[PDB]
């Protein structure tokens, strides 16, 4: 074996120029795609508000134009998937994961158009789902497309270009280049076997994607939270405590998304029509609550500044947590196209500040700021449920830029994954590819 590795040690990182260059174009397309998707979600969201002003006296009629406007776009997105591409429901990260384990196709000729348009319907109606879900699966399939159209052969090329696509997807959805690379390296690579994924190439496309976004998105941060205070050593144990509660809740939240997947299938039975009207009902509740109580609906990125700044009561904070747990399940367990990441960031922060609020009142000697605990709980449900702590950590850091808090973010994150494991939880993307693979055999 020894002489074989002196051979291979000397051949390390020599990615084929063909794959390097193609990973450039994959990154550029996923960029424009994600940018396109983002502006479409935004534009539908504004026109629905401009409807609520055409109708701003008759509060009953207003509440109805709320419901119907989201119900329609919801259905349209629901319908697009079950008629033309059912593997584009939900997040789609798990599908792209199976594509890398070579047990699931990448039907780009169908998914790109349905996920894009079907997502815009459901996201642009204001249901609580993230841009991530669409972009990442849109980006993988743009990888597969670029592969087939140039007919590049070999296993490096297929798994690389599909990784670099799903990477550049997440990066473009969050403006987080490092988080994109770390997300495939930590979570999306095939996890039980060696692989041929060039990470120089993943890096090449992530760059391209991030510049694409920057061209059409300069000026404005997804999440502006300002520079918070520091964490004294003698306050660190408080974050390990915050971790443990994330690490018991983490698995319970997974239980709920899985059981509510079951529970909602019992409603429509699988019937393409009762399903699409069930999604019209969910969409419309979200567009109604969008008007009636915005902190319960939508992706969640807006309340993140407010909650970190301490500008919510704890009364309101408990309201939003229960409420957003509920809309989050109903939206993501129903199968609508749309990610689970960005609502898990919001869910996380609000619980985080609520801890900090209690913690501030209990130890004035610590000179706490209730908002640092918010930053440390943002990627904490990502750690406890997705079991991608290193990705949540760098994702939260890329978005909120308070590096002075890296230690407490780590400490809450590790405690989340640690108690997640020791409590008996399973990685949630893994536990649903599992189930779609478990039926993709139990029908034989």
């Amino acid at each position, epitope marked *: 074996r020894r002489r074989q590795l002196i051979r291979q040690l000397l051949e390390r990182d020599k990615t084929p120029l063909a794959i390097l260059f193609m990973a450039a174009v994959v990154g550029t397309l996923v960029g424009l795609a994600a940018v396109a998707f983002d502006k479409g979600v935004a534009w539908l969201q504004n026109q629905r508000m401009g409807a609520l002003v055409h109708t701003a006296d008759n509060y009953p009629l207003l509440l109805t134009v709320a419901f119907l406007c989201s119900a329609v776009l919801a259905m349209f997105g629901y319908f697009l998937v079950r008629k033309y591409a059912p593997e584009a429901g939900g997040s789609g990260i798990p599908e792209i994961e199976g594509a890398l384990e070579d047990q699931r196709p990448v039907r780009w000729w169908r998914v790109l158009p349905v996920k894009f348009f079907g997502g815009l319907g459901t996201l642009g109606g204001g249901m609580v789902l993230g841009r991530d879900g669409p972009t990442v699966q849109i980006g993988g399939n743009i990888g597969r497309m670029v592969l087939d159209i140039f007919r590049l052969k070999g296993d490096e090329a297929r798994h690389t270009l599909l990784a670099t696509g799903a990477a550049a997807g997440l990066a473009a959805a969050f403006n987080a280049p490092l988080a994109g690379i770390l997300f495939i390296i930590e979570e999306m690579r095939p996890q039980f076997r060696y692989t041929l994924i060039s990470i120089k190439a993943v890096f090449i496309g992530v760059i391209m994607s991030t510049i694409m976004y920057r061209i059409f998105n300069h000026e404005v941060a997804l999440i502006d939270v300002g520079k918070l205070s520091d964490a004294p*050593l003698n306050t660190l144990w408080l974050y390990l405590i915050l971790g443990i509660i994330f690490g018991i809740f983490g698995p319970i939240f997974n239980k709920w998304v899985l059981g509510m997947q079951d529970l909602l299938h019992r409603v429509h039975g699988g019937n393409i029509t009762k399903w699409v009207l069930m999604g019209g009902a969910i969409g419309g509740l979200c567009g109604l609550l969008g008007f009636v109580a915005p902190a319960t609906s939508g992706g969640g990125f807006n309340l993140i500044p407010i909650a970190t700044a301490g500008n919510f009561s704890m009364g309101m904070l408990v309201f939003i947590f229960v409420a957003r747990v509920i809309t989050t399940l109903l939206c993501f367990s129903s199968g609508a196209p749309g990610g689970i990441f960005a609502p898990m960031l919001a869910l996380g922060t609000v619980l985080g500040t609520a801890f900090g609020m209690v913690a501030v009142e209990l130890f*004035p000697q*610590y*000179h706490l700021e209730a908002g640092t605990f918010a930053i440390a709980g943002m990627g904490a449900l990502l750690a406890a449920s997705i079991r991608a702590p290193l990705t949540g950590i760098i994702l939260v850091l890329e978005m909120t830029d308070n590096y002075q808090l890296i230690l407490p973010m780590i400490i809450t994150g590790l405690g989340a994954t640690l108690l997640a494991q020791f409590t008996g939880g399973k990685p949630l993307y893994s536990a649903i590819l599992a189930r779609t693979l478990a039926k993709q055999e139990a029908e034989q």
Partner: antibody, heavy 121, light 107 residues
Framework: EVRLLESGGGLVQPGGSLKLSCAASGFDYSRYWMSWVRQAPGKGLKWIGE????????NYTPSLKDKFIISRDNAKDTLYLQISKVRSEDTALYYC??????????????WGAGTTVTVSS | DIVLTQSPAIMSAAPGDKVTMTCSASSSVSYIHWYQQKSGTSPKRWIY???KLTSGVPVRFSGSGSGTSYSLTINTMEAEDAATYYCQQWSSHPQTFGGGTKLEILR
């Protein structure tokens, strides 16, 4: 260097009120908790209160309602203390301080020269 | 709240000689600080977290303690060590100083 300059102390008649001032130079007066400690005629140091850089937190020592009122104007880089209903117990050299920590056990980092308040008829 | 009581409320000692102050707390306290004060001038931070000197404070000075008894000592005293040394706590809220001990030259 770092400079803390208190003004505003003088003679006050009992039951009156005053407003002492503390002017900060040589450092970013934001990012720091500020504090007030007074030392009575020949006795020990006693903590009045403190204010966080954003004025979202203001904690006082055990003592009545409008007692003292700490406030800060990071725009002009000065810290304030209003005392009301001044009794003779309030005759004291009043110190302004900047707070910090090491392991997280907070301490009184840099102090000013002080001002004296005499309350007397 | 915590009550710090410093031991030799007042005391003299000759230069080049080893002195030792005490700080004794009603309940338990962690990482105590010590301020030197000489008349007419603001208190100075001297020793913080039970043990660490401030940048400038010469190395003769030192402190140590745990739980409920703490101390400051001056291996070789100078003449300029004449001042009042206030121990102070913030392990608990609210924070409390001690009474002080004044240290004067002996001649």
């Amino acid at each position: 260097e770092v400079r803390l300059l208190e003004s505003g102390g003088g003679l006050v008649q009992p039951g009156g009120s005053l407003k002492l001032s503390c002017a900060a130079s040589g450092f970013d007066y934001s990012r720091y908790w500020m504090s007030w400690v007074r030392q009575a005629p020949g006795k020990g140091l006693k903590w009045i209160g403190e204010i966080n850089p954003v004025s979202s937190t203001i904690n006082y020592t055990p003592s009545l309602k409008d007692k003292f009122i700490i406030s800060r104007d990071n725009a002009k880089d000065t810290l304030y203390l209003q005392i009301s209903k001044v009794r003779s117990e309030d005759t004291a050299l009043y110190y302004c301080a900047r707070l910090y920590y090491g392991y997280g056990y907070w301490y009184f980092d840099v102090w000013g020269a002080g001002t004296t308040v005499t309350v007397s008829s | 709240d915590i009550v710090l009581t410093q031991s030799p409320a007042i005391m003299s000692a000759a230069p080049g000689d080893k002195v030792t102050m005490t700080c004794s707390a009603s309940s338990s306290v962690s990482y105590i600080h010590w301020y030197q004060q000489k008349s007419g001038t603001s208190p100075k931070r001297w020793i913080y977290d039970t043990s660490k000197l401030t940048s400038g404070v010469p190395v003769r000075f030192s402190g140590s303690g745990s739980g409920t008894s703490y101390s400051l000592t001056i291996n070789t005293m100078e003449a300029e060590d004449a001042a009042t040394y206030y121990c102070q706590q913030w392990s608990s809220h609210p924070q409390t100083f001690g009474g002080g001990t004044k240290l004067e030259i002996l001649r």
